[PDB]
Design a protein around this ligand. Structure first.
Ligand SMILES: O=C(O)c1cccnc1
Ligand SMILES: O=C(O)c1cccnc1
Ligand SMILES: O=C(O)c1cccnc1
Ligand SMILES: O=C(O)c1cccnc1
Lengths: 482, 482
């Protein structure tokens, strides 16, 4: 009762009830456009890193209602056989346009756009949000942390702290995309090809009862040695014992260094560095793992801590300070009775809290001469900035802040992934995604990617797109006048 | 590269490297006891609700290294064939004792205990933590929220906001255990048998362009009608239109009520109640869904909001204010050279931040006469309070706070689940778990389960258990004297 063989019902019940309402009344194949976007920059970071495309692609390619799916809906929920045969025959026939994994993405712009039969668009929203919200959030958190670390290793060590198992594997993949250098999760190494990393735990040390014997046991059985030194006493017990083992084993091991999981690291690591150096191990590194995030790491570095490798657990994999992105999936255009597409709106008070209507594209604008970031320019589908000598970029709320831009490149961010349910996009390798992310981040102007108080990245609606929104808003507010 | 057919490598790499170190040196089958516990009450709640046992059981029953598992370890990580054949032949042979799902659980007491070969115990820690940390956390969050709501429905609606897909399905199951009445997640209904619930979305309304036509379309195609009224204007558009549809359809539908997803609900819901009542729909309910948690819900109720049903999204399913439980899995006893078990310790400064050593049991103490909660009493394995006329319960830090207890019942909390890898525990149905949770909560003394400033539930170490800890701590601190 019943077999977990399918993600097709990983959705909100109200989607199936709406699909029924559409289908019974002959409106399931009305033409719709839906868009996915978030409203606020996560962590107030200067940029976000998109993740979730490979996950979504696999989901959409397997989007059929299984025998057990239908049996549940028939036997428990008592849907009629007519509707059920519609669901049995269902195959995905929407166009999907998306940012690619590793793209920089920002608030108030479409990141994924689904276009096709209303009922099919409706089915996919919940699962897409579930996967994209989380994966983008962790990729951005890892970028945030990696930015503060610099070139030194960031190791994603948070599986034990993650919000169930998918979170651990797909989160760690997203972390690698966003800036982690390795994972602890062996299975994520297996299935994604992420480099895998480890040291040892206190349990090894306690199994012997002293540091020397445990470090020796590890040295006898492994080439690459990082010794965890704080089981009993970092300075008096662990570090001297690590040094003793390193001396006795010589070049038969790599003494990569020592891990410290406790204490005030801004004092502890400084004295440990001295101990290693005075013993002649001036290349042995100090690995830290306790309570790390972009804030404590930045402080530790600025205090002149001597830490070379950062194993980050809880705060990265759960995005602990803001554990949800707040992406939403909204209907922006729908086929009217006359067969023509109509811009659709929901009212709020804050006219910026209102979803911008219309089928849109996002154009990343840069200065041709030196590739300077000029911001994103969000158009209706019928505008192509590439054919315009000059564009008018204004802030959508603060419209008195504005510039005419000439001599620019405009790159369309939403790419075809499926056309009418047919995949036209070849999935990159994970390393290619990570390289793509690095290059995109490297190209972003320093002001938008700096760690402290980044400049706000413009996301501007075209004159036409903005006028369409405000005219529709005006029209509905006046319709609600009576 | 390679097939995701297995959870056996869903672990930290350092576990496999330790298993190798144990195995090569003939110590893999040393006898070990490991215990899982958390240090702080999540959300500062008065109690926690344990979840994760069914999940763990399924994991442990399938704990074999697959062909693709071994191929990864051979081809990528280059482990030796000897060790690999050990892993190929691996079968789980540990005893597992656990709290049951729906048990009340507290900080600083073992909740799961694994006993058997050191190398096997080591393998399972990471996955167990991943699943139990999250599921217990969400079950407790749901209890917390449900406590503030009272008898009215709590609906878990957060799939779209969850941290990837496992989080959504297993989180929603945990929410049902802890106090939710239904889920939106259809797949969780399918595979777990949770009651499933829904209304409709704004997209239905926008597909028509007005409330009346969309509410009518929904009424023509469904018996149970909840109309979402805030697409355009709750008071002027949606609620009058819902009322019109209700009037026109009469007893051909159930007009269950109206959903409001926006506005100040403490004003909005009061006026909506008036509108429904004045129209003669004094049984139609008001459903709220926006930005809900135990805090905003409590405030809304205390402001005399007229809300009857609570659809909770982000803050429940992600445990947003504290998205990790902080459970850890620690070696407490290990076979020594002489073949006898030895209490094992790791030093910290705070002697309460030190893991209590020894194989332990947790006894829930109640007064026989009226079943009053007296707290938990954590013993070494060789003490059975049931055979003692009187027990001495003292606070482990504040030892001057203490009582002798007579005429008590002592119930052992850790139950046999696997004996030497063999399942002796029959899995309850989800409804039986939820009933068990309800009854356990109902039996907890009011002071420990009250919403505001609950009394701290005693978790006391027996005289023997406490003396063992402090003597070992003293011994190691004096060993570190030189
Ligand atoms: O390899 C390690 O040191 C490690 C990995 C995950 C969690 N804690 C430690
Ligand atoms: O902040 C913006 O959106 C902006 C800034 C400069 C010029 N145009 C728009
Ligand atoms: O059924 C609903 O009303 C619902 C379910 C999940 C998320 N939002 C709304
Ligand atoms: O808080 C405690 O642990 C406690 C309270 C009363 C008596 N004994 C212990």
């Amino acid at each position: 009762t019943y077999a977990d063989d399918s993600l097709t019902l990983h959705t909100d019940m109200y989607q199936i009830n709406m699909m029924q309402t559409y289908w019974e009344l002959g409106r399931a194949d009305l033409h719709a456009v839906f868009e996915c976007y978030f409203r606020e920059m996560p962590f107030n970071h200067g940029y976000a890193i998109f993740a979730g495309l490979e996950r979504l692609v696999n989901y959409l390619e397997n989007l059929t209602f299984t025998e057990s799916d239908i049996a549940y809906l028939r036997e428990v929920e008592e849907y009629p056989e007519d509707f059920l045969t519609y669901l049995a025959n269902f195959e995905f026939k929407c166009t999907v346009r998306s940012a690619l994994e590793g793209d920089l993405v920002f608030n108030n712009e479409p990141l994924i756009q689904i276009e096709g039969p209303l009922a099919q668009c409706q089915l996919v929203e919940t699962a897409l949000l579930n996967m994209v919200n989380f994966q983008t959030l962790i990729a951005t958190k890892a970028a945030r942390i990696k930015s503060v670390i610099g070139d030194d290793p960031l190791l994603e060590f948070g599986t034990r702290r993650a919000q169930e198992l998918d979170a651990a594997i797909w989160g760690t993949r997203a972390a690698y995309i966003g800036g982690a250098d390795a994972t602890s999760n062996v299975r994520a190494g297996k299935i994604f090809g992420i480099p895998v990393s480890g040291t040892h735990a206190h349990s090894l040390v306690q199994s012997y009862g002293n540091d020397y014997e445990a470090f020796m046991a590890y040295a006898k059985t492994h080439r690459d040695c990082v010794f965890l030194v704080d089981t009993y006493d970092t300075l008096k017990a662990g570090v001297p014992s690590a040094i003793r083992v390193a001396r006795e084993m010589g070049d038969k091991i790599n003494f990569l260094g020592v891990r410290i999981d406790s204490g005030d690291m801004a004092y502890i690591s400084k004295r440990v560095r001295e101990q290693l150096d005075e013993a002649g191990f001036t290349e042995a590194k100090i690995y830290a793992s306790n309570d790390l995030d972009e804030n404590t790491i930045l402080n530790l570095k600025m205090q002149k801590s001597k830490i070379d490798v950062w194993g980050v657990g809880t705060k990265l994999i759960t995005a602990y300070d803001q554990p949800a992105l707040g992406a939403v999936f909204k209907l922006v255009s729908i086929e009217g009775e006359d067969g023509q597409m109509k811009d659709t709106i929901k009212l709020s008070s804050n006219a910026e809290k209102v979803t911008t209507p219309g089928k849109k594209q996002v154009w990343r604008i840069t200065r041709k001469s030196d590739k300077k970031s000029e911001g994103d320019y969000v158009t209706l589908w019928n505008e192509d900035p590439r054919q315009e000598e000059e564009i008018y970029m204004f802030h959508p709320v603060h419209t008195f802040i504005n510039k005419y831009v000439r001599d620019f490149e405009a790159r369309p961010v939403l790419q075809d992934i499926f056309v009418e349910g047919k995949r036209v996009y070849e999935l990159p390798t994970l390393d290619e995604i990570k390289q793509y992310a690095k290059e995109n981040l490297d190209s972003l102007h320093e002001e938008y990617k700096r760690d402290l108080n980044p400049q706000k990245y413009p996301v501007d609606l075209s004159t036409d797109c903005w006028n369409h929104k405000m005219n529709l808003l005006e029209k509905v507010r006046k319709d609600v006048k009576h």
